[PDB]
């Protein structure tokens, strides 16, 4: 936010506001960022994939 408020340019106005929106969406939603790298993998029921 400080970098976007202080420094202003043609290429600085973009590629930074989207990052701020991404940080806000990751903070307000509660979802941890480390949750993007999954540890356990879920697998479908067997009835949704018959023999």
């Amino acid at each position: 936010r400080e970098e976007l408020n202080e420094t202003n340019s043609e290429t600085k106005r973009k590629k930074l506001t989207k990052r701020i929106k991404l940080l806000e969406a990751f903070v307000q939603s509660g979802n941890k960022p480390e949750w993007m790298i999954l540890t356990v993998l879920p697998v479908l029921p067997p009835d949704l994939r018959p023999l």
Partner: protein, 48 residues
């Protein structure tokens, strides 16, 4: 006329008995889609 399992039998019963009443419930395909989405690392559920 769809994949709703708990509705087809009830509609057949109402037509044989002459009631002409519909109970929608929920299609099974939506549950299949929910399970297939939950098969990945993306949580999804329906609130109240």
């Amino acid at each position: 006329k769809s994949d709703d399992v708990n509705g087809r039998t009830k509609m057949y019963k109402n037509i044989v008995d002459g009631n002409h009443q519909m109970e929608p419930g929920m299609p099974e395909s939506f549950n299949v889609l929910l399970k297939e989405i939950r098969s990945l690392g993306i949580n999804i559920e329906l609130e109240d």
